[PDB]
Structures are given as C-alpha cells and as structure tokens.
Design a protein around this ligand. Structure first.
Ligand SMILES: NNC(=O)[C@@H](O)[C@H](O)[C@H](O)COP(=O)(O)O
Ligand SMILES: [Zn+2]
Length: 440
C-alpha cells in the first residue's frame, strides 16, 4: 500500500436523469471496481464523483478505507503541494472535482455561479448552495453526446421570435419588436451595442421564465402540435429541432425547457473524443451520452427547467451574462502532451482556459498494446480507466504494479511518474484512461 499510487472507490449519485442499472457507465464502473456492491437494476446511476468534495467521498480501499479528503487534510504538502495549497487556498481538498456522467434524460436547464455569486448564494441559502465556490466545467464525449450550451446568435433568436407563434405569444409582439429592432450587429464584446443587445435578450428571457405555469402548459401543447403539423417552420431554424422538441417533451411533458432550452440555446453535438468548456454562468443542459466531466470543486447550480429539483428562476435570470457568441468558440482544440511518451495511439491533452484542471487522455490499440510513461506532474491527479484493461505502476518500482481494469480509479501524488501497460492476453478492447490533474 503505497501512498503515491493507490486505488479509490468513489461514490455516485442516483439522479433521475441517469441511465438505469447496468446500462449506466457509472453503475458498470462502480461494480467493476467493487464487485461486492450490488447494482440496483431499477435505479438511475447518473454521476460517479472522483474527488474530495464533502457531498460524496472517495475511499482509499488499501489505506484502511479513509477518505481521500481526510488523507489530503492529514498530509497537504505530500498530496497537494505548496504551489496548489497557495494558489487555490486550501489545505483540505482538491481544487477540482472529476466525474463520469451517464445520461439518459436531459439535465436541468442550469448555470453555475462565478466567484462573486458563489459567495452571495452560499451566504443567502447555504442549503441549496452548499459551498461558496464558482463552477466552470468541461465535458469530454466518451460516447456521442448532445447538449444545450449558450444563447443562440441573435439573428437565429430574432428568426425564432418572429416565426414560432407559441413563443411570440408568450413574449408579446411589442417586446418581440423591441428585441428585433433594437439588436445591433456586428457588435464587439464590451461595446455599448453589445451591452444593449444583452439587456434586450434578458428582457425576452425574463418575460419567458416568469410566465405562469398553466400558460406554459397550454403553449407547449400547441408548440408540440405545430412540430407535427408544420415541421418546416422548425427545420428552417435548425434541421434537428422538431425531433428534439418531440424527444424532450416525451421526457418532461409540457416543461418550460421546451421553450427556454430548445428555442433559445444552441443544440450542440459532440462526437466521441470531442470536448467543450463552459465558463461560470454559461447556461446549459446536457441531453444524451456518456461523458467525462471535470470542474472546479463545487456543487453550486442554479436550475430553471427540465427538473424536479430545486429551481431558482429569479437568480437564473439575474446571473446570466446573456452572451450570444458562437458556441464553436468553446469547442476545444486537442493538444499534444510532451510529458507522456510510448506506445499509446492517442495521447491528448484537454486543457481548457480554466485554472483548476486539465485532463489527459491515453488510448492503446487493442491489438498493438504496449507501454506509456508519464512524468511526475506538479500537482495531484486522478486516473480512471474507461475501457479495456491493463496495469498501472510508479515508473521503475515494480512492487507498485496493480491491475487497472475498466472502472478502476487511482490517485497519483504530485511528482509521481506513472507507467501504464495495455493487457497483452487480449486483442478486443482499446485500453483507455483519463487523468484529471492540476498544476499551478
Ligand atoms: N453540467 N453538468 C453538471 O454541472 C453536473 O456536474 C452537475 O452535477 C449538475 O448539477 C447535474 O444536473 P442536475 O442539477 O441534476 O440537473
Ligand atoms: Zn453544469
């Protein structure tokens, strides 16, 4: 039992939107790692939490089952290092939380606070806002993924406002006119034209979000009818849109998210391996797929639709920046990672412009196999295997060699060089790992 490289058994969340039972990647990974856990086949397994966030612990199975949070707290210098202790301001915890999500139904229409709102929300309602942190995040598609992310460009929103009768009726023609006349493009971010564009978009969004629920139920029914009788109205906005509306209405009948997500937010698809980042306060809602997520350590979320959980429409309306930048600006270029070398066919850094984390992906071909060696990184890491199997060890110390099968999660102490090996008695699954880490 090395304290440098060691297995962790991570807790999970059974949120409603999760894939059910053994069809969930969360359930699969949990059970794989600890075959003694009985998967409840009737239950959703939505999120695997890998981290030191107090809401869900990770336990070091060969270090007397103590929690990762406790182990950090007992030895901050060894587990975090002074650079991470100083930059992020804690001796107790990781500044990131790393997750697997396995999504069956769309998540809440949601936004996470920045630092200022984080502190204010936590102070005003610590029950619903359980810490004071911000939560920028990143998603990496493990299977093909869809989600909502950011307000659509203004010309698309103007078109939608003019051509979708059920939305136009909720907003009212005077406000639709005010919005469509008033917007000015191009507008540089920060310019008075931009400021005014955002104020107009906030007026439209607030009018929608504060509409009486019985009105929303009446208009959603008519919207749904219209996707059937006049699909082309919807396809002219975006070709996937009538089917989207139909599919989400089956999940959450007559939900306000049919207006506020489907009509106002970009519908993003990510192919497997593609990724996107979300700065704090970007509005979003993940629709489908299995993903890796990494975020600043927080569970603050303001929700406003597609959920039975706590909704706070007024905070949502007030906090959003109302940016309408193209969503392509937050799809990430994949980068090379010099500090890893070997036989892996993919070795890919996902490093968004967010201080609290990066993620390194490693993939070995099923037939080719081989070994990859990664230098010690200047901060704590979590590694998960999402596919295939192999072995993991501290480089040059064969006594630390351990099996790493699908779903196994390991902590790696700062400075510790790692060597991965693909299983060789095997030629059918590409051994694949994701490692979340941070460096000042
Ligand atoms: N974008 N994804 C996330 O922020 C997830 O990590 C959080 O856990 C979300 O809060 C999950 O969505 P619900 O609150 O259950 O609607
Ligand atoms: Zn989120």
């Amino acid at each position: 039992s090395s304290e440098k490289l060691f297995r962790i058994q991570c807790g999970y969340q059974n949120y409603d939107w999760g894939k059910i039972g053994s069809s969930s990647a969360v359930a699969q990974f949990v059970h794989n790692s600890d075959p003694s856990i009985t998967i409840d086949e009737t239950k959703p397994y939505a999120e695997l939490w890998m981290g030191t966030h107090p809401s869900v612990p990770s336990k070091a199975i060969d270090l007397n089952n103590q929690t990762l949070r406790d182990l950090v707290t007992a030895k901050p210098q060894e587990y975090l290092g002074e650079s991470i202790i100083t930059k992020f301001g804690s001796s107790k915890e990781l500044p990131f939380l790393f997750k697997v999500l396995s999504i069956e139904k769309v998540l809440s229409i949601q936004a996470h606070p920045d630092k200022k709102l984080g502190a204010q929300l936590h102070a005003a309602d610590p029950k619903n806002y359980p810490d004071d942190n911000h939560k920028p995040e990143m998603a990496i598609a493990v299977t093909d993924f869809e989600g909502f992310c950011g307000f659509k460009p203004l010309d698309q929103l103007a078109k939608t406002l003019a051509t979708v009768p059920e939305l136009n009726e909720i907003i009212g023609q005077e406000l639709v006119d005010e919005f469509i006349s008033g917007i000015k493009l191009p507008a540089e971010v920060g310019s008075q034209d931009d400021v005014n564009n955002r104020k107009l978009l906030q007026k439209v969004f607030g009018k929608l979000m504060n509409t009486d629920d019985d009105v929303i139920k009446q208009q959603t029914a008519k919207l749904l009818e219209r996707t059937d009788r006049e699909p082309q109205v919807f396809k002219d906005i975006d070709s996937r849109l009538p089917e989207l509306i139909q599919r989400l209405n089956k999940q959450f009948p007559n939900d306000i998210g049919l207006f506020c997500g489907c009509l106002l937010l970009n519908h993003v698809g990510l192919n497997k391996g593609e990724a996107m980042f979300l700065q704090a306060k970007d509005p979003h809602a993940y629709i489908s797929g299995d993903i890796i997520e990494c975020m600043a350590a927080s569970d603050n979320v303001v929700r406003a639709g597609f959920t039975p959980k706590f909704k706070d429409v007024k905070n949502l309306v007030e906090m959003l920046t109302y940016s309408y930048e193209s969503v392509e600006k937050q799809k990430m270029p994949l980068q090379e990672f010099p500090r890893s070398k070997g036989d892996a066919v993919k070795s890919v850094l996902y490093d968004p412009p967010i201080a609290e984390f990066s993620v390194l992906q490693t993939i070995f071909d099923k037939s080719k196999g081989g070994k990859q060696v990664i230098e010690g990184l200047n901060g704590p890491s979590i590694v998960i295997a999402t596919n295939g199997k192999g072995t993991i060890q501290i480089t040059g110390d064969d006594s630390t060699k351990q099996k790493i099968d699908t779903g196994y999660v390991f902590f790696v102490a700062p400075g510790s060089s790692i060597e991965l090996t693909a299983d060789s008695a095997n030629q059918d699954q590409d051994f694949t790992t994701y490692r979340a880490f941070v460096e000042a």
